[PDB]
């Protein structure tokens, strides 16, 4: 009946915490160089008994792997080669793209020579014909390097020693709130850092029903995640067979110019099933009736983030998306969807510098799964009457969002100290 | 055998029966072929999981128990700290609970400790004729 | 600069009332009016801030409104503790410059 | 629960200088000011100054060169000057203190201000950016400023008041 | 935590009637759910239990065939209390049926009690009767 | 107390894609230049204690 404190090192405790997570890799300089290999089997520890809040939207794993992304993506780029100089008067003659000759630097300082590329109608702008590439006023440019792939692989997020994570297992698990089944695993499964806008791709698919997260749903303001139970197949190709001119600029700098077309006038594209695009826009709009219906297009102004934007291949695609959301919902055949390219992109022009995509010379040709969606409502008109849903791909974050729902981090406090009937040895 | 935190949810007396599973895969050692971003990052977590160890291990020493795992103490259980009977605490609740409810006053206690510890060895410093 | 009201209103026992306060877009029009009550006697007591909010303890049926630069004090069920002089107030441009109306007196008829 | 006290001279000579103190005790401020009003018989109110707590003062701008404001933070008072006295100035004056407050013009909550939209797009009320487009222009992301007062003031406590006649 | 039972029900005699007992203020996956009778002529008579978590039963032999119990599949509230829902099906009732009927959230998580009636609730009235 | 009482003005004139210098716009006001006060009697009390440590 006499109580004395003891203490208990190694108890099950842990508590919410922040840190400095590490990636990992096994099978393209972003990941390939990565880290440490991952171990031969991890370990998923289910955990009996256990409910544990999580909340997807507070989560620091999708700030550090946004930042992260952002740090490779610098540091893949500053190597390579720079295009300064490629901002010469450009004089411009049609074939969209557009046939434009202009001098550039030989490797001689006092030699010049008139050369020629084909440019899309994105990357160049006219001023006063004379013209210019579109980023000259605004940013320097420089050229991603041909050997690097912006093909996303699988990365594992990681938490260090004394730290785990916490993984729900629960199928109907809701963005926020307590899982009652959680088992704790020190990686993560493999995650794509697949870059998208509107719809995602290669994301990893809900089991049961399909997922309907957001942060608020009767908020307008906070976007709205989809995620399908079953993947979606979208086969993506740009038709023109374009060819790689190099010509050198300088001592070992090299442009890599687009050559002739060869073969068809036909602009990219992707095809999507009928058939499944529309029992997942049925179950899509059950589960977004389940909280409640028309879906009409977003029309903002910046391209890369109206149109369904990713990377394929190499070639940085931009998809008119009105094919998939012109619907109204009370309750093969496959759809097409035109895509532009661009080459010259500014996610961070203004934090850093621009990039120049080069170009890609033959066919080009991907076939991804769509597994999630990025929604939007409008502004609430008269309540309860219709609403309407836009796409939107705002912001890179959401996706990692959308992959890293599942997993919470936290630091394990081993130090209980607990009442026995316990004393020392006397003195 | 369960794994690691696998008695989480279990009581308070089944996880402290294996406690020493917890406590033994809280320490890794992930080789390493760095030879970057990631490099750095890898530098700094290194770091910090046998910087929390050796502060646990530290607290465990100037406690008289740098043996780890269990020890006693000549620290009394003052009631104010928690009003539960031994059946209820070691049978009714898990560490989590256990350690939010006792979270408020977990420093006093430890202060307790080193002080009793510091005055048995000051008597085994007296304790020779 | 002063905001225009009437000079008097008065009303019977068990009705409604409204003053009228006309400004301009630099005070009014700001959208930020109050109102006060002065009853001979006691010291000003403050009823209405920021166009619509009533003061504690003053009743619903001391209603504030504004439509531009005019802005419009409503009183319903008259009572005879009502009878004073109203005067409205408004920011004019700084946020520690206040201006105030000209003042309508309340007068309550038919008393026992 | 705030308390002022007023006090000073009852009677004035003309042309005196009048010089009032109000002592504030029990202070629950937020912000805030302590100032000054006035009211002729039979006469409407007419706003005179005030002190706010970062020290800027302000007068009446149609009276301020016969006004004076100062504080005293140690003493816990104000003081009022007012030179020139006539029998324009016998009037009731009442020691105030009222809420002050400038609101900027802020973006909802989750919208940053992003004036590209409107620069390269030419849309109206699309001065803020739903954050969820992450500095992108999107136009069902559009939104006005948070619709309030530019300028919000009215008077929180009234003191007693102070009556100052002007007489040989 | 507080358990929340059924009101009342009237039935015949020869009829069945189901008694149901949600839960509260506490993990209703952890606790077992004993179901007793309180009848004026026989006195207290304990009837049952029912693991939420496991699902397994113990019924006493005097109603092993006419009574069943389900639970259904907690619902969290915060990590450390939850909501659930325990029924108790009665058939075949006499007059000595009727009573006073309650649910109980047992005494520890491990022991020599764990079962043990502890937190109970408001009770259920069963009337039978023409 | 130091002012440059010179009402400069900054000419932000783009030079390369991205570079952008800030030349140094025509002057507003008067052609004084700056310059710093110190209050001469405090300074002769602090140089008076100055000789003497
Ligand atoms: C997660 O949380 C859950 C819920 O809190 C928790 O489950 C509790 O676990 C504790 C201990 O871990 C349990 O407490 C122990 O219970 C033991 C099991 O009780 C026995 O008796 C049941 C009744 O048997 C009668 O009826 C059957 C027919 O139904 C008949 O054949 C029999 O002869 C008898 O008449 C029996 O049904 C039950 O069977 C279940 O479990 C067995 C495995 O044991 C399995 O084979 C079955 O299929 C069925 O699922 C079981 O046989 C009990 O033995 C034990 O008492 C001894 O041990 C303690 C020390 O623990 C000693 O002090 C004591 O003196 C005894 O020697 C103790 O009472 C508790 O009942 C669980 N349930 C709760 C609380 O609701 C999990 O463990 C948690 N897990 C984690 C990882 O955290
Ligand atoms: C998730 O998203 C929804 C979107 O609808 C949000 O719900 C709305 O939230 C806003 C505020 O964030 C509400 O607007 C405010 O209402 C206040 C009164 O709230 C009570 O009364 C309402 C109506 O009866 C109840 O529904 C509510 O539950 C409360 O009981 C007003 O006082 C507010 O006005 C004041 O603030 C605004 C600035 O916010 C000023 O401009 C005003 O002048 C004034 O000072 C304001 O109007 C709105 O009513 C909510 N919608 C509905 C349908 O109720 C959720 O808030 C959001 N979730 C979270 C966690 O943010
Ligand atoms: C996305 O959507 C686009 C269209 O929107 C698809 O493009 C089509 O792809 C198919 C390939 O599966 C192309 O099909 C080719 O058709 C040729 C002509 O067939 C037509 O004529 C006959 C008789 O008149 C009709 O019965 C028939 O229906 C067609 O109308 C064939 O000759 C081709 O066969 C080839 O293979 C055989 C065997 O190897 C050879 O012997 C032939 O000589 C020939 O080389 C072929 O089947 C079709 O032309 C494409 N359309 C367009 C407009 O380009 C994409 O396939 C789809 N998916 C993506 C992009 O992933
Ligand atoms: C979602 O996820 C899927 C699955 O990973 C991705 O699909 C991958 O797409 C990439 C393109 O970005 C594919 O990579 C390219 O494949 C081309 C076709 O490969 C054929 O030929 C090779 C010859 O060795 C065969 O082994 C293979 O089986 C195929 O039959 C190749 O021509 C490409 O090679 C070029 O690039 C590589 C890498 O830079 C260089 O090393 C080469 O020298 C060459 O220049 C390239 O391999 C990849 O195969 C696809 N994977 C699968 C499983 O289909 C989607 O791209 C992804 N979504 C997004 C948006 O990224
Ligand atoms: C460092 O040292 C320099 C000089 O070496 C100082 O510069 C002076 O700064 C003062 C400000 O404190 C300037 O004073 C201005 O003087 C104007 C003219 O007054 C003259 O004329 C009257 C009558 O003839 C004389 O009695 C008086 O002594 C002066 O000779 C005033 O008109 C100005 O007043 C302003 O404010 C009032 C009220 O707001 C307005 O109504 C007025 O219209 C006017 O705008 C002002 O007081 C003085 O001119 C400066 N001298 C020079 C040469 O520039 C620096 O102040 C000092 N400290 C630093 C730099 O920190
Ligand atoms: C995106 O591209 C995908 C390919 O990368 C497309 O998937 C392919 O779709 C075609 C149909 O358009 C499938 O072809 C079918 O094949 C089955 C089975 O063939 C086998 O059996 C027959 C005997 O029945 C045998 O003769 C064959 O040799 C095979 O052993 C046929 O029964 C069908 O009639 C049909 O021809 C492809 O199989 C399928 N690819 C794969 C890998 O399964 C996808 O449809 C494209 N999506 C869009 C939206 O364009
Ligand atoms: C220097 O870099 C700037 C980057 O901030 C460039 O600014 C953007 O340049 C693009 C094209 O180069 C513009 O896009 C065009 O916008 C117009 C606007 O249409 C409206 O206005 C016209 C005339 O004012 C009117 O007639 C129409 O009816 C519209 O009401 C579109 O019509 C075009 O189709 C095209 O989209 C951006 O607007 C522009 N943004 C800003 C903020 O200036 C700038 O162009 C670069 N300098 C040069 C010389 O190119
Ligand atoms: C460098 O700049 C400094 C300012 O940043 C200078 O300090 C200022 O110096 C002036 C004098 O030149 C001081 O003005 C004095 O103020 C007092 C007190 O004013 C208060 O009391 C009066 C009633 O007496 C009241 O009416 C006011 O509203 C105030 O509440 C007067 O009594 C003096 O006569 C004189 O006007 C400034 O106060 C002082 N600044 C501060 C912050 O104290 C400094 O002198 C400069 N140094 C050099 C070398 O140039
Ligand atoms: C983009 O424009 C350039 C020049 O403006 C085009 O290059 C030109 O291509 C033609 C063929 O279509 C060349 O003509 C042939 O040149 C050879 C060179 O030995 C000559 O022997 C033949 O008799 C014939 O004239 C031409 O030389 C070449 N360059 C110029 C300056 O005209 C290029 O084809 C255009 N690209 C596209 C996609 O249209
Ligand atoms: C999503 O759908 C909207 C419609 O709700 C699309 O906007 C519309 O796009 C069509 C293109 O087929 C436009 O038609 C063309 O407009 C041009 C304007 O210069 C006109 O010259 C042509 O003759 C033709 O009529 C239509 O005007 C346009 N309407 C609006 C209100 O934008 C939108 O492009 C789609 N966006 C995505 C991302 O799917
Ligand atoms: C430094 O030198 C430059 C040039 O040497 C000066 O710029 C010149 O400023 C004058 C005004 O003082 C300008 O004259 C006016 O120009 C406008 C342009 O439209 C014209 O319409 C007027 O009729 C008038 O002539 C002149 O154009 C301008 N540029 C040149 C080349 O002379 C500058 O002012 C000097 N800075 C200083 C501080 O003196
Ligand atoms: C995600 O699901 C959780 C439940 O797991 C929701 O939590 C409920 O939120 C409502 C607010 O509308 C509360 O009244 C309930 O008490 C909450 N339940 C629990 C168990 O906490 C949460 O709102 C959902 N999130 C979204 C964005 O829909
Ligand atoms: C126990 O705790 C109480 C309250 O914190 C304190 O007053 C007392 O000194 C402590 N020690 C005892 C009772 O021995």
């Known amino acids: 009946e006499n109580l004395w404190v003891t203490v208990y090192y190694g108890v099950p405790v842990w508590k919410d915490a922040e840190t400095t997570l590490f990636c990992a890799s096994d099978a393209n300089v972003w990941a390939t160089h990565a880290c440490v290999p991952t171990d031969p089997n991890p370990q998923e520890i289910h955990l009996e008994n256990v409910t544990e809040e999580f909340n997807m939207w507070k989560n620091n794993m999708v700030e550090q792997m946004h930042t992260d992304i952002i740090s490779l993506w610098d540091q893949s780029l500053k190597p390579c080669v720079k295009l300064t100089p490629l901002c010469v008067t450009l004089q411009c003659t049609n074939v969209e793209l557009k046939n434009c000759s202009f001098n550039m630097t030989t490797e001689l300082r006092d030699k010049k020579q008139k050369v020629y590329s084909l440019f899309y109608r994105l990357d160049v702008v006219q001023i006063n014909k004379e013209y210019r590439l579109i980023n000259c006023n605004t940013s320097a440019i420089t050229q991603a390097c041909p050997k690097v792939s912006f093909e996303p692989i699988p990365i594992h997020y990681c938490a260090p020693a004394g730290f785990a994570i916490l993984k729900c297992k629960d199928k109907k698990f809701n963005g926020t709130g307590p899982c009652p089944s959680v088992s704790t695993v020190q990686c993560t499964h493999g995650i794509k850092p697949v870059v998208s806008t509107q719809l995602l791709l290669n994301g990893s698919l809900a089991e049961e029903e399909v997922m309907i997260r957001s942060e608020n749903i009767t908020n307008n303001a906070k976007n709205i995640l989809v995620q399908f139970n079953t993947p979606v197949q979208i086969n993506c190709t740009r038709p023109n067979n374009n060819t790689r001119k190099s010509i050198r600029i300088g001592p070992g700098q090299a442009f890599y110019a687009t050559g002739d077309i060869i073969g068809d006038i036909r602009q990219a594209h992707c095809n999507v099933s009928k058939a499944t695009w529309n029992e997942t826009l049925g179950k899509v709009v059950k589960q977004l009736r389940k909280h409640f219906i028309r879906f009409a297009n977003s029309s903002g102004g910046d391209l890369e983030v109206t149109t369904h934007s990713f990377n394929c291949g190499g070639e940085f695609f931009y998809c008119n998306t009105s094919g998939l959301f012109n619907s109204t919902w009370i309750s093969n055949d496959s759809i097409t969807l035109p895509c532009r390219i661009k080459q010259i992109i500014n996610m961070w022009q203004r934090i850093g510098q621009a990039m120049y995509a080069p170009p890609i010379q033959g066919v080009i040709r991907c076939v991804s799964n769509i597994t999630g969606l990025i929604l939007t409502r409008d502004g609430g008109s008269t309540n309860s009457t219709t609403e309407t849903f836009r796409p939107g791909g705002g912001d890179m974050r959401d996706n990692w969002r959308s992959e890293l729902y599942k997993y919470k981090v936290v630091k394990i406090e081993p130090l209980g100290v607990a009442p026995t009937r316990c004393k020392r040895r006397v003195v | 055998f369960l794994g690691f935190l696998g008695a989480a949810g279990s009581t308070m007396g089944a996880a402290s029966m294996t406690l020493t599973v917890q406590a033994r895969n809280l320490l890794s050692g992930i080789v390493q072929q760095q030879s970057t971003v990631w490099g750095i990052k890898q530098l700094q977590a290194r770091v910090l999981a046998v910087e929390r160890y050796l502060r646990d291990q530290q607290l465990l020493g100037i406690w008289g128990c740098s043996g780890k795992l269990i020890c006693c103490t000549n620290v009394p259980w003052n009631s104010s700290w928690s009003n539960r009977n031994l059946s209820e605490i070691w049978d009714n609740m898990t560490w989590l609970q256990w350690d939010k409810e006792i979270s408020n006053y977990t420093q006093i206690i430890y202060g307790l400790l080193e002080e009793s510890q510091n005055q048995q060895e000051k008597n085994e410093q007296d304790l020779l004729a | 600069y002063e905001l225009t009201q009437p000079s008097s209103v008065s009303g019977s026992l068990g009705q409604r009332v409204s003053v009228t306060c006309s400004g301009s877009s630099s005070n009014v029009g700001n959208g930020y009016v109050s109102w006060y009550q002065l009853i001979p006697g006691s010291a000003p007591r403050t009823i209405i801030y920021g166009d619509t909010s009533r003061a504690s303890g003053v009743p619903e049926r001391f209603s504030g409104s504004r439509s531009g630069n005019t802005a419009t004090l409503t009183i319903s069920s008259l009572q005879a503790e009502d009878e004073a002089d109203f005067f409205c107030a408004s920011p004019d441009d700084s946020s520690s410059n206040a201006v105030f109306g000209s003042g309508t007196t309340l007068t309550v008829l038919g008393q026992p | 629960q705030v308390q002022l006290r007023e006090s000073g001279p009852s009677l004035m000579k003309p042309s005196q200088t009048l010089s009032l103190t109000c002592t504030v005790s029990g202070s629950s401020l937020n912000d805030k000011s302590v100032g000054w009003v006035r009211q002729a018989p039979g006469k409407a109110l007419q706003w005179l100054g005030s002190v706010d707590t970062s020290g800027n003062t302000d007068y009446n701008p149609g009276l301020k060169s016969r006004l004076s404001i100062t504080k005293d933070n140690s003493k816990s008072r104000i003081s009022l000057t007012v030179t020139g006295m006539t029998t324009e100035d016998s009037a009731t004056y009442y020691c105030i203190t009222a809420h002050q407050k400038t609101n900027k013009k802020e973006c909802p909550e989750d919208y940053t201000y992003n004036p590209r939209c409107p620069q390269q797009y030419g849309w109206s009320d699309c001065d803020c950016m739903g954050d969820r487009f992450g500095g992108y222009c999107r136009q069902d992301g559009c939104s006005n400023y948070i619709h309030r007062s530019t300028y919000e003031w009215y008077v929180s406590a009234w003191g007693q008041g102070l009556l100052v006649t002007v007489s040989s | 935590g507080q358990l929340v039972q059924s009101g009342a029900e009237l039935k015949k005699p020869g009829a069945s009637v189901k008694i149901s007992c949600k839960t509260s203020?506490?993990?209703?996956?952890?606790?077992?759910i004993n179901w007793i009778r309180q009848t004026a002529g026989r006195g207290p008579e304990w009837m049952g239990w029912?693991?939420?978590?496991?699902?397994?039963?113990?019924?006493?032999?005097?109603?092993?065939?006419r009574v069943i119990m389900t639970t259904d599949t907690e619902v969290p509230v915060t990590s450390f209390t939850s909501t659930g829902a325990a029924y108790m099906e009665i058939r075949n009732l006499k007059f000595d049926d009727t009573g006073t009927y309650f649910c109980?959230?047992?005494?520890?998580?491990?022991?020599?009690?764990?079962?043990?009636?502890?937190?109970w609730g408001q009770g259920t009235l069963l009337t039978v009767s023409s | 107390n130091c002012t440059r009482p010179n009402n400069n003005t900054r000419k932000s004139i783009r030079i390369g894609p991205g570079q952008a210098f800030y030349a140094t716009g025509d002057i507003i006001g008067d052609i004084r230049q700056a310059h710093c006060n110190v209050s001469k009697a405090t300074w002769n009390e602090t140089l008076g204690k100055v000789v003497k440590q």
């Open positions: 029912i693991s939420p978590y496991s699902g397994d039963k113990n019924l006493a032999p005097a109603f092993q065939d």
């Open positions: 203020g506490y993990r209703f996956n952890f606790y077992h």
């Open positions: 109980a959230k047992g005494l520890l998580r491990d022991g020599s009690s764990t079962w043990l009636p502890y937190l």
